[PDB]
């Protein structure tokens, strides 16, 4: 199917507790493959997936060099943002960056991304055209002007359309056993009496990969969007994910309810019911 490569970066200042902590991770879909932590004993870009371990020492040195240079520019940017937002040097602040690419089943570029946030709010983002910017406010408009003068968008576009898609293709082939395998969900319905007059029906989905899934309950064939309790998809810790959806059903009416499950690993969407 379709795939993505993303790099995530977070810098968190801690005045009076040394320099900002920098943590960056790389993913292909829902698989972590590299990490770098400035608070580690010997900070380096470390492999986290067996299919990336094959990359040579010249590759690890390159990646480590980029991570160290990015931690440094983030430290400079955190100082800049204190000035742009007229803030004191006493508080802790957060800088986040994500960039990457999406490709279709044929490996062609679907779209590219490059976006930043300050203190959890949008700051500046490269538009889908990979040629213009969206600035959240008058402070980000200063960065927009600097980036337009420096033709940053053209540099980003070249990476997102070139190296980003080519290396994502390389990783997908090297990791085809895991990256190109969808694990369908293991599904079941549980019943939990709440009182004499109602019970909970919980529809489970376990052991699936990738994380993307749709779990819904219907009553007499009508979607129960408002009345369904849907937990956020959660990692099991073995690469797979979990999710459940629950509905409160009046005693004896369990057969009016049906659970619907959509997942990439399923050739056709499934329908489940509470069996006993």
């Amino acid at each position: 199917g379709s795939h993505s490569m993303r790099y995530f970066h977070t810098s968190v200042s801690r005045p009076g507790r040394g320099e900002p902590r920098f943590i960056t991770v790389g993913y292909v879909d829902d698989t972590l493959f590299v990490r770098f932590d400035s608070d580690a004993a010997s900070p380096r870009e470390e492999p986290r997936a067996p299919w990336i371990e094959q990359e040579g020492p010249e590759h690890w040195d390159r990646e480590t060099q980029i991570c160290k240079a990015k931690a440094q520019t983030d430290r400079e940017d955190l100082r800049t943002l204190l000035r742009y937002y007229n803030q004191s040097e006493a508080g802790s602040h957060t800088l986040q960056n994500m960039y990457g690419c999406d490709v279709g089943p044929d490996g062609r570029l679907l779209r590219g991304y490059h976006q930043d946030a300050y203190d959890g709010k949008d700051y500046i983002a490269l538009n889908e055209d990979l040629s213009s910017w969206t600035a959240a406010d008058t402070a980000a408009q200063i960065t927009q002007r600097k980036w337009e003068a420096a033709r940053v968008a053209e540099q980003l576009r070249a990476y997102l359309e070139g190296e980003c898609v080519e290396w994502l293709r390389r990783y997908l082939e090297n990791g085809k056993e895991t990256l190109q395998r969808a694990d369908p969900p293991k599904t079941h319905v549980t019943h939990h009496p709440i009182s004499d007059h109602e019970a909970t029906l919980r529809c489970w989905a376990l052991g699936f990969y990738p994380a993307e899934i749709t779990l819904t309950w219907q009553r007499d064939g009508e979607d129960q969007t408002q009345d369904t309790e849907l937990v956020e998809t959660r990692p099991a810790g073995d690469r797979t994910f979990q999710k459940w959806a629950a509905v409160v059903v009046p005693s004896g009416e369990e057969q009016r309810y049906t659970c619907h499950v959509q997942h990439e690993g399923l050739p056709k969407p499934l329908t489940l019911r509470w069996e006993p």
């Binding site: 980029i66 991570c67 500046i124 600097k146 980036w147 940053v152 540099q155 980003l156 980003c164 290396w167």
Partner: peptide
């Protein structure tokens, strides 16, 4: 593979 480019706000 990371982008080697460096840019400042």
């Amino acid at each position: 593979l990371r982008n080697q480019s460096v840019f400042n706000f």
